[PDB]
Amino acid sequence: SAGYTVLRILPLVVLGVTFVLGVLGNGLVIWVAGFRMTRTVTTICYLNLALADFSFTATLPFLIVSMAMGEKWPFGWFLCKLIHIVVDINLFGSVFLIGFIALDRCICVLHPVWAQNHRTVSLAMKVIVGPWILALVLTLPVFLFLTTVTIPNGDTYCTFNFASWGGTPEERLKVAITMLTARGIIRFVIGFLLPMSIVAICYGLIAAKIHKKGMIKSSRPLRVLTAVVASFFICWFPFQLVALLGTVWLKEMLFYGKYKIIDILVNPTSSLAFFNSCLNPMLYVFVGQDFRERLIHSL
Amino acid sequence: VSAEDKAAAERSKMIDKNLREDGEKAAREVKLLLLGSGKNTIVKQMKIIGIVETHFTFKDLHFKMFDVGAQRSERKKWIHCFEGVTAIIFCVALSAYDLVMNRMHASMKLFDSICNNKWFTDTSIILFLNKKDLFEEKITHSPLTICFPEYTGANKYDEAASYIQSKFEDLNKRKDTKEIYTHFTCSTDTKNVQFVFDAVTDVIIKNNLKDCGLF
Amino acid sequence: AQARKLVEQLKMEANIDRIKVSKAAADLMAYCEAHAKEDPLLTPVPASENPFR
Amino acid sequence: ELDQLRQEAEQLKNQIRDARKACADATLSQITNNIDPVGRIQMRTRRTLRGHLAKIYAMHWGTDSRLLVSASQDGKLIIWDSYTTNKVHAIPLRSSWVMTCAYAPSGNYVACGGLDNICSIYNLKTREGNVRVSRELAGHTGYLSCCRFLDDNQIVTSSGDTTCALWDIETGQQTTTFTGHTGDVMSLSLAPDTRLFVSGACDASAKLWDVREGMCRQTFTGHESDINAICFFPNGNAFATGSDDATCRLFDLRADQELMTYSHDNIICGITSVSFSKSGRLLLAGYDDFNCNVWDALKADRAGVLAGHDNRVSCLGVTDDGMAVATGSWDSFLKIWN
Ligand SMILES: CCCCOc1ccc(C(=O)NN2C(=O)c3ccccc3N[C@H]2c2ccc(OC)cc2)cc1
Numbered sequence: 001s002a003g004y005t006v007l008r009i010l011p012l013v014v015l016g017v018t019f020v021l022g023v024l025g026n027g028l029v030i031w032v033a034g035f036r037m038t039r040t041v042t043t044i045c046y047l048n049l050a051l052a053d054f055s056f057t058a059t060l061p062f063l064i065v066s067m068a069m070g071e072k073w074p075f076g077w078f079l080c081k082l083i084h085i086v087v088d089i090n091l092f093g094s095v096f097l098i099g100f101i102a103l104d105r106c107i108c109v110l111h112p113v114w115a116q117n118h119r120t121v122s123l124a125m126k127v128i129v130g131p132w133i134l135a136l137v138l139t140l141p142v143f144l145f146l147t148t149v150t151i152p153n154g155d156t157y158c159t160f161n162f163a164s165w166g167g168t169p170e171e172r173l174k175v176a177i178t179m180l181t182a183r184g185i186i187r188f189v190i191g192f193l194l195p196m197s198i199v200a201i202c203y204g205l206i207a208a209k210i211h212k213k214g215m216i217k218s219s220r221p222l223r224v225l226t227a228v229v230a231s232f233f234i235c236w237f238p239f240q241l242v243a244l245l246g247t248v249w250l251k252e253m254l255f256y257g258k259y260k261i262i263d264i265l266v267n268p269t270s271s272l273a274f275f276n277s278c279l280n281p282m283l284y285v286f287v288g289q290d291f292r293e294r295l296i297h298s299l
Numbered sequence: 300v301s302a303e304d305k306a307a308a309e310r311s312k313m314i315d316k317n318l319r320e321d322g323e324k325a326a327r328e329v330k331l332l333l334l335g336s337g338k339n340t341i342v343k344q345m346k347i348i349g350i351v352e353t354h355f356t357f358k359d360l361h362f363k364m365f366d367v368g369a370q371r372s373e374r375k376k377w378i379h380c381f382e383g384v385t386a387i388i389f390c391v392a393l394s395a396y397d398l399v400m401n402r403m404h405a406s407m408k409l410f411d412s413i414c415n416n417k418w419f420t421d422t423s424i425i426l427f428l429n430k431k432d433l434f435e436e437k438i439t440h441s442p443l444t445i446c447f448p449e450y451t452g453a454n455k456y457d458e459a460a461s462y463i464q465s466k467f468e469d470l471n472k473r474k475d476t477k478e479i480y481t482h483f484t485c486s487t488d489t490k491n492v493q494f495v496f497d498a499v500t501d502v503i504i505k506n507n508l509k510d511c512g513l514f
Numbered sequence: 515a516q517a518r519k520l521v522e523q524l525k526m527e528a529n530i531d532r533i534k535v536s537k538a539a540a541d542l543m544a545y546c547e548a549h550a551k552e553d554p555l556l557t558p559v560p561a562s563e564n565p566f567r
Numbered sequence: 568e569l570d571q572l573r574q575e576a577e578q579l580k581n582q583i584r585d586a587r588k589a590c591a592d593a594t595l596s597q598i599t600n601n602i603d604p605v606g607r608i609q610m611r612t613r614r615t616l617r618g619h620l621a622k623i624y625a626m627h628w629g630t631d632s633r634l635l636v637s638a639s640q641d642g643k644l645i646i647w648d649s650y651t652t653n654k655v656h657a658i659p660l661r662s663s664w665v666m667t668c669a670y671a672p673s674g675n676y677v678a679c680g681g682l683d684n685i686c687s688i689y690n691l692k693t694r695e696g697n698v699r700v701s702r703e704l705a706g707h708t709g710y711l712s713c714c715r716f717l718d719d720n721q722i723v724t725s726s727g728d729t730t731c732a733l734w735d736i737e738t739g740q741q742t743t744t745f746t747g748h749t750g751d752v753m754s755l756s757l758a759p760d761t762r763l764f765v766s767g768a769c770d771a772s773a774k775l776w777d778v779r780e781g782m783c784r785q786t787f788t789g790h791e792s793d794i795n796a797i798c799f800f801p802n803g804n805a806f807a808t809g810s811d812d813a814t815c816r817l818f819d820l821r822a823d824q825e826l827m828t829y830s831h832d833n834i835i836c837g838i839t840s841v842s843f844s845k846s847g848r849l850l851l852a853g854y855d856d857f858n859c860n861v862w863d864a865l866k867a868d869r870a871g872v873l874a875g876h877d878n879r880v881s882c883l884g885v886t887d888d889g890m891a892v893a894t895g896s897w898d899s900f901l902k903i904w905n
Contacts, residue, residue, distance in 0.1 A: 211500065371709065534593070555610070
């Protein structure tokens with residue numbers, strides 16, 4: 001009864017809070033770490049992550065407006081294309097850069113000599129382009145296949161129209177089921193499994209090394225490590241699991257209407273997943289003494 | 300005359316590129332400040348391949364060691380120049396506990412001044428307690444009460460050296476940001492340089508953790 | 515002869531000609547007043563003839 | 568006989584103090600009570616010179632008031648064009664522990680020095696096209712704290728070995744040695760006629776030396792801690808010292824006494840550098856508190872603040888035409904203000 005309305009507006013308010021906090025925090029990180037601090041490898045990584053999160057959260061009002069009226073698109077074809085391009089590029093870049101930061105920290109901790117001899121700002125700038133290239137490659141079907149479809153009652157949904165690529169009245173089956181299944185599998189494997197495995201393995205190695213070397217004086221290192229790992233997991237795993245379940249039950253969901261719970265769990269879980277964009281600056285940037293000192297000295 | 304303006308801008312950009320490359324090369328070295336006594340012996344140990352600089356390489360890590368023993372002037376006027384070194388190596392002759400103001404007392408005062416210094420709040424200190432064999436030979440004929448009247452242990456090298464190590468590490472009034480790595484210097488090959496490598500590796504790891512945000 | 519050098523230096527320093535602090539202050543004021551118009555930091559120059567924009 | 572000599576020295580010091588007090592009749596603040604305040608000196612960062620990767624310890628302006636040399640502990644001596652922020656030169660130093668640098672009045676040479684106890688002279692013309700070490704001066708047993716060119720062939724260096732020296736660059740020999748201090752000399756300033764120079768040391772005293780003769784003409788005292796900086800008044804009859812006791816002072820050679828003290832209760836950090844303006848009306852002083860303070864040199868007031876650096880302001884200079892002020896800092900940046 002009333003609980004359904006609560007589940008209706010809960011993702012909306014979560015996304016609005018995410019928009020406000022993400023814009024504020026990512027703008028603060030960009031300003032400070034790009035115009036008041038010396039350029040280092042960690043500063044470059046934080047700047048790239050902040051740019052991804054900020055560009056994603058700047059598109060959040062459009063997604064909130066679209067979701068509030070039942071996935072309808074009130075804007076134009078160009079805005080549908082541009083907004084979804086930005087969303088995909090920056091949402092994949094966020095997880096790729098989180099994995100990149102985890103790998104960089106693991107290398108710095110486990111091979112300090114190699115990090116001292118080879119980890120430089122120029123090399124970091126050269127190699128941090130890889131996550132962006134992978135995100136851009138994953139965003140290609142948004143460039144090509146996505147478009148705005150107007151169903152008879154002028155409803156204007158921005159979806160993956162396949163009529164242009166089809167040639168038969170059965171061009172939906174085996175051409176859209178296959179594409180959506182591949183999309184969901186890639187989403188789970190590359191959007192969640194790869195960055196999650198990288199993050200977990202790297203931070204577990206860091207924790208084990210600093211425990212064996214007896215560097216744990218306070219609880220702060222372990223608190224920060226567990227917060228960084230658990231925030232990524234708690235934010236992304238429910239949404240990725242729901243999306244993967246929808247992928248593996250796609251045919252028997254759309255053909256007959258079996259799993260409606262997976263259908264109605266998409267919005268709250270996706271809002272929780274997108275909350276990580278506003279969570280990231282607090283986890284990675286507003287945890288450093290030097291950054292906090294520079295921020296308070298700047299304002 | 301704008302061709303010369305573009306030529307000047309090009310030359311400045313080339314100089315900028317050279318400066319960036321030179322800074323990248325320089326940041327790769329590990330800067331060590333050597334203070335102290337067996338300082339020359341330690342330098343000879345770390346000897347492979349106004350102020351005197353000694354460069355060596357161990358396990359693909361490059362160390363630049365600076366000796367400022369020939370600076371008879373006031374230290375506080377130039378000591379800030381070494382704010383930012385990876386670590387400080389402090390040499391103390393264990394056999395100075397007999398020599399006279401007591402030599403070991405003067406060494407303790409210098410160590411206290413260096414360790415509790417506003418420019419070295421977080422800099423780690425590698426303390427070498429040299430002349431172990433001479434100290435062991437002298438500890439059987441001159442008791443540590445000659446230097447420390449409050450000592451109560453037997454005239455044994457182990458106890459009389461543990462006391463000195465503990466009472467040198469007690470002068471660290473900031474055991475929350477810096478570490479003191481104490482090594483009893485021995486003539487064993489590569490031992491002191493391996494100890495320096497281990498301590499510097501720990502310092503580098505801790506600096507990386509601080510920079511990332513864990514520490 | 516460090517003591518002799520100190521004695522000679524102090525004797526030479528004492529056997530010097532000193533003037534009034536009022537006279538010295540007047541000279542400093544006169545110099546500052548004479549060269550005030552030519553001081554670009556005391557009186558900033560217009561941006562047309564300012565080399566640093 | 569040592570006791571009698573000490574008593575005689577004490578009575579001579581008493582006589583000198585009595586003579587100074589007798590010649591002291593009016594104060595600088597009393598004489599300048601009538602004059603109007605300068606106002607509020609508000610300078611703006613016109614240029615920001617970046618490119619040093621470590622703390623900047625010294626800088627000097629060229630006589631043409633356009634080129635400036637700076638020294639950093641990254642082992643670099645950079646010559647900049649201040650108008651365009653173009654790096655004209657970048658000389659690598661054999662010793663990275665540089666503490667001072669000088670620009671020749673002709674602009675043909677540059678100088679540097681530091682913890683190596685050596686003043687290095689660099690030829691800037693170099694028709695071959697590459698800056699070369701023209702001469703290396705040795706003989707100081709302490710760190711090089713300051714150096715200033717008299718000509719293309721003469722340079723005066725103050726060292727931490729308690730002495731100062733006037734050199735012959737062509738022969739590389741100490742032409743004259745100035746002794747008398749009892750602490751490390753940390754700064755020196757040449758008179759406008761290059762006939763005398765003042766030096767401030769860690770014994771909390773300043774001394775005036777005749778270059779041609781080589782003896783201490785006058786000794787000025789009154790600071791409580793080490794004098795870190797010293798500068799000459801433009802007319803050459805007075806000078807200003809900045810020390811670690813957070814005060815600057817103005818001394819008069821002719822009256823042989825202190826004139827004015829520049830200090831505020833809100834300032835507790837020492838002065839790193841001092842520099843007059845073209846008329847001598849403004850005294851700019853660098854501080855450890857990351858700021859430069861512009862003082863009214865006549866009324867002892869504070870006329871302005873330059874606050875643009877994140878670390879110590881170690882070097883400070885005013886151009887020969889008085890147009891701009893360059894301020895170098897430990898945050899690895901130089902800033903030109905107007
Ligand atoms: C054959 C396929 C090749 C390309 O592979 C894929 C697979 C899946 C997607 C995808 O889900 N994009 N999103 C959308 O549609 C969206 C649409 C509206 C609002 C938010 C969205 N969030 C992204 C998104 C979700 C999860 C992510 O995890 C890191 C990243 C981005 C995009 C491309």
